[PDB]
């Protein structure tokens with residue numbers, strides 16, 4: 001009974017804010033996602049050397065910023081000194097919560113199990129009902145659960161051998177959703193993916209769809225064939241997704 005995530009309307013989140021058009025995991029992309037009609041955003045977080053929760057997808061700042069290094073081995077002053085595009089600086093999770101509408105949804109993907117303690121603290125101060133914690137790393141989710149056992153939680157899946165484990169993980173972690181990549185459709189096949197989703201849903205789990213390439217939502221009408229079987233879609237191109245779902249007559253802009 002979390003009304004922020006349990007809705008009749010499909011939820012659209014911007015991937016890394018809105019990485020199709022604005023610098024990924026930046027405060028600029030977040031505001032733009034919301035103005036384009038997203039319900040919220042998904043971000044990636046790590047813990048800096050001096051114990052601050054910062055936003056970054058990769059384990060080094062190489063690729064999105066003009067500098068080099070591993071953020072887990074750097075401090076926040078060193079990091080706010082990078083440019084991640086369009087003048088934007090690496091934000092902290094606290095900055096993210098100041099920028100967002102107080103009712104906007106936020107999916108925090110924990111990339112760093114060491115960040116779990118601080119993420120749970122910051123979240124408890126910023127209206128946890130609108131937060132989803134997710135991770136590929138079961139031990140990050142288990143650690144998060146030491147500090148917060150009520151926030152909505154999704155398991156990110158990227159390996160086939162994780163799927164049979166889901167009923168026990170749901171128990172151990174109190175999962176709300178399994179967060180599935182559209183890449184599963186080519187890689188394991190549409191029908192096997194469909195039956196796996198159907199089985200997960202029969203366990204009482206909700207479904208979050210994501211992808212590294214929005215083309216996979218639309219090719220072979222992959223997403224349309226899954227209508228009724230997902231609650232949340234994480235899109236790199238928010239405007240395109242918002243328009244598509246309105247064009248099917250299922251989600252009003």
Ligand SMILES: CCCCCCCCCCCCCCCC(=O)O
Nearest residue numbers: 158159160181183184187196197200
């Ligand atoms: C409801 C669960 C069923 C779905 C199981 C699918 C398992 C994943 C297999 C494909 C992984 C592809 C991930 C590529 C993108 C990435 O890792 O960033």
Ligand SMILES: C[N+](C)(C)CCO
Nearest residue numbers: 042109156210211234
């Ligand atoms: C970023 N996601 C939450 C969509 C999964 C990892 O790439």
Ligand SMILES: [Mg+2]
Nearest residue numbers: 042043044109
């Ligand atoms: Mg992510």
